[PDB]
Design a protein around this nucleic acid. Structure first.
Length: 579
DNA sequence: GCGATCAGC
DNA sequence: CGCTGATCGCA
């Protein structure tokens, strides 16, 4: 339908200093993937270009790389990375419709031009899944169909820029787009392209040890069970535990029985088999997800993994990481933690450097609640769980037992997640009355936190949304629901989203400031990963002493709060040793 | 095609 | 009780 020049050569009217640009990568994983088509819409009209044509043309290449030639795009990062794998630099992206839509309303799950277009009732563009299929049926169509789709996406971006920018400006989110998320997009592009080197023989050796401890564990489970069965089947396990061996059921489920780790540790004392199933679950998880699954996505040439950071998915402003997920690499239990020995510097005589905010959520809570007891605790750099135990249990420091600190720590998680008696009682394996007593004691010791939690729910009902430090927004329409379970979950989101979201805003601003400082200092050090409240870098050995001073300082000074931001850091030959 | 489970923050 | 993603089993 839509009119445009299906051009076979590049012309200077395609290289105007403002344009909507689509550099289409249809492969879901864009790492070293083909670019199937190019669309440009600018003051002169609408243009489709074959990529072999466009990317061979020196003038088109230079227009891509010229920061002065402004481009409006959807998912710039996708385009930037696919171009990086071809040695082509993309610059001058001044508007990204994906990030604009994400900031206006994260709840829409906008992941294509069509869904962003719908927020302004622009319907003259198809959804990607209607054009390409999905997953199994993910094929590039014939040139006429492809070209009309790309040109209609570019035209949608062209028309949608100014209404998205006017709404962002009304929301006071204009700076969140221009000065935080879009510069971060570039930084994520570099991190993903660089990747993380994996020691694949370390992982294969761990794989072989786990296959033997799994074998040893399966047949003692079979011995104790008096029968062979699929241990990885929650259904067949539940029959073995609750029907054949007649173990008690503490947590009744509508369907069958729960075999969650929560239920199995209460069942450990009644039967030997239980602990063995939990050891088996821990090893089978290392084996399937972190050994086998990691090895499947290592590039066999470089032995690097190239995560994709989804910048536009989480309801709080956090990143997510896929294929592989480099934000859930084991660390808590020692045998899982060894996996991190396989994550190594990409060059001879480089080291891994990890810096992590200490208790950023509770420090952000202290800031926004202006609780004088919590702010003083941080100004004194106290152990916050110990001091919370001292206050809610009414004891001196010396009188806090390890069980008291364990319980106070779970209250502190509770407070930032949005406490409920039923939630804390579940976590602590106590009654609801006992948990409500802890919560009451917490609020008598931190009355500013109690005020804040009432005033922010009260503010979420009046406004219909909540905000973070840097004006990220989440809409909480379930705040006015007559169903108790659905309205309490909205009240929890109103308590938690400003905390978790403020913490995301701060680490995103740190990453931007860190990269400016690394460039000013012309250090070879670079970001590999973000894990929510930690940055992981690799650098030459020679740079370690300067980064021990520079990275913490940049992360501490990212934002000014009423309490200090505290950062710990470590470095070593492997991610494991950076502890 | 989704629930259960478990890894991270 | 907050936020995620991957694997597996079973439909």
């Amino acid at each position: 339908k839509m009119a445009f020049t299906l051009a076979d050569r590049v012309t200077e009217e395609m290289l105007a200093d403002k344009a909507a640009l689509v550099v289409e990568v249809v492969e879901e994983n864009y790492h070293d993937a083909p670019i199937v088509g190019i669309a440009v819409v600018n003051e002169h009209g609408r243009f489709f270009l074959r990529p072999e044509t466009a990317l061979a043309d020196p003038q088109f290449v230079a227009w891509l790389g010229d920061e002065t030639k402004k481009k409006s795009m959807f998912d710039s990062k996708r385009a930037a990375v696919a171009l990086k794998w071809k040695g082509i630099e993309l610059c001058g992206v001044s508007f990204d419709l994906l990030l604009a839509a994400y900031l206006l309303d994260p709840a829409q799950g906008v992941d294509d031009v069509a869904a962003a277009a719908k927020m302004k009732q622009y319907e003259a563009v198809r959804p990607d899944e209607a054009v390409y299929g999905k997953g199994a049926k993910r094929a590039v169509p014939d040139e006429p169909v492809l070209a009309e789709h790309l040109v209609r996406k570019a035209a949608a971006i062209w028309e949608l820029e100014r209404p998205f920018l006017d709404e962002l400006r009304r929301n006071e989110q204009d700076r969140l787009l221009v000065e935080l998320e879009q510069p971060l997009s570039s930084i994520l592009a570099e991190m993903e392209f660089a990747g993380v080197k994996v020691d694949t023989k370390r992982l294969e050796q761990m794989g072989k040890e786990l296959a033997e401890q799994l074998g040893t564990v399966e047949q003692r489970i079979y011995e104790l069970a008096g029968q062979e069965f699929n241990i990885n089947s929650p259904k067949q396990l539940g029959v073995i535990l609750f029907e054949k061996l007649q173990l008690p059921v503490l947590k009744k489920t509508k369907t069958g029985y729960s075999t969650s780790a929560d239920v199995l540790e209460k069942l450990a004392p009644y039967h030997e088999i239980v602990e063995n199933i939990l050891h088996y679950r821990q090893l089978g998880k290392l084996q399937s997800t972190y050994i086998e699954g990691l090895l499947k996505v290592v590039r066999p040439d470089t032995k690097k993994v190239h995560t994709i950071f989804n910048q536009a998915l989480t309801q709080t402003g956090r990143l997510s990481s896929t294929e592989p997920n480099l934000q859930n690499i084991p660390i808590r239990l020692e045998e899982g933690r060894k996996i991190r020995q396989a994550f190594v510097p990409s060059e001879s005589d480089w080291l891994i450097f990890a810096a992590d905010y200490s208790q950023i959520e509770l420090r952000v809570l202290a800031h926004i609640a202006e609780d004088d007891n919590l702010m003083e605790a941080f100004r004194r750099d106290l152990d916050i769980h110990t001091k919370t135990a001292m206050d809610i249990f009414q004891v001196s420091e010396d009188e806090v037992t390890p069980n008291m600190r364990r319980q106070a720590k779970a209250v502190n998680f509770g407070i930032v997640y949005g406490i409920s008696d039923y939630g804390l009682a579940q976590n602590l394996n106590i009654s609801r009355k006992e948990a409500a007593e802890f919560i009451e004691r917490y609020f008598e010791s931190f009355p500013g936190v109690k005020r804040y939690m009432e005033n922010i729910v009260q503010e979420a009902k009046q406004k219909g949304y909540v905000t973070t430090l840097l004006h990220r927004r989440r809409y909480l329409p379930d705040i006015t629901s007559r169903n108790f379970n659905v309205r309490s979950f909205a009240e929890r989101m109103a308590m938690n989203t400003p905390i978790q979201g403020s913490a995301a805003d701060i680490i995103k601003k740190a990453m931007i400031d860190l990269n400016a400082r690394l460039k000013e200092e012309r250090l070879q050090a670079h970001l590999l990963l973000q894990v929510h409240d930690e940055l992981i870098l690799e650098a030459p050995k020679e740079e370690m002493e300067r980064l021990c001073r520079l990275v913490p300082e940049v992360m501490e000074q990212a934002v000014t709060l009423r309490v200090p931001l505290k950062v710990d850091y470590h470095y070593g030959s492997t991610w494991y040793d950076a502890k």
